Assembly symmetry: C3
Homo-oligomer: 142 residues x 3
């Protein structure tokens, strides 16, 4: 079976290598990020990522933030991130319900104070709280 396992691991590396060369994914630690280049609103990005078997991307580390920012830069668009401050204002949570730890707010942000429940990322990787109805680059994590 060890023959099978080595071969399997090698083939997985080949396919991920191919996708990484084609610019179709970025691997960061345990996470893989990807975009198909389309721009839609926050709710539609969630459905899109979920349909593909993943989730709207969120950076929980400086390294993850840089990877998503590099995607925002390459595709030159603002990006919606997987966090919201719905139920309680000023209190941003990941979509799994956990309170946000790492942040990278653009100076002055977040300033919505009720009416801005989503978070967008600028091309320099910094964050702004925003309404959820804008068209933003869809980035998913797997």
């Amino acid at each position: 079976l060890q023959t099978e396992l080595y071969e399997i691991k090698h083939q997985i590396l080949q396919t991920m290598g191919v996708l990484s060369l084609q610019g179709s994914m970025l691997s960061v630690g345990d996470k893989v990020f990807s975009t198909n280049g389309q721009s839609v609103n926050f709710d539609t990005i969630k459905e899109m990522c979920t349909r593909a078997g993943g989730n709207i991307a969120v950076p929980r580390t400086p390294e993850e933030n840089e990877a998503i920012a590099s995607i925002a830069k390459k595709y030159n668009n603002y990006v919606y991130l997987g966090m919201i401050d719905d139920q309680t204002e000023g209190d941003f949570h990941y979509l799994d319900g956990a309170s946000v730890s790492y942040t990278n707010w653009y100076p002055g942000e977040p300033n919505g104070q009720g009416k801005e429940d989503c978070v967008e990322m600028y091309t320099d990787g910094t964050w702004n709280d925003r309404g959820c109805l804008q068209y933003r680059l869809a980035v998913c994590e797997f």
Copy 2:
């Protein structure tokens, strides 16, 4: 080894997630469908799919039919399916030799009665028996 197996399964899911996000595959049950968007005749589609390690797509379930129809719709072209009524007329078989079960004939079809040995799918997912020399969207199953 359980560490290896969990990691392997996760990486497989990441790559399939990426391909699904990019619109490069559709997963239905055990089957994966894909097209590269090219149009060729029936014999050439078979060679193309076989070269890639798969087979010309055929729907054996309503669910599979819908998936292929969604590809025909997205690419806006008629699609050749993996069935033929060669040796016996009115008797359509899969390419593995088995008699066809599920069908979705457009009203009046099949009407070839000798001279139409292939099957094409319209953009609404319904079927027509047809000659095999037309240029149709190549869709493969894996």
Copy 3:
């Protein structure tokens, strides 16, 4: 676990099938070749392939040569290969340090005699020793 292993192997085959259909990879024996279609110099191709988890492509067999030549033909560009004759002139080595075995020099080549330390492949698959600063099609192996 056998259920897991069969399923894993099948899913790997599906993803590789998809990538092969999309024209995003060529499998030869143990090797997988891929290009993203970009043209850069020798040093930049190495970095690009390494970033993706692979290496600049080199043919060690007639079969591997044909696969890379088919990529050079499809993309209609000269290709840099993973071999150099740096430290000793007339003495080409793979990037792992081993002396080159299989060759396919265009008639008259190699003729650099000091000043041509890289190797390019023409669209017909034959080789020429060349300087390393030209823009060539980036082809990686995994």
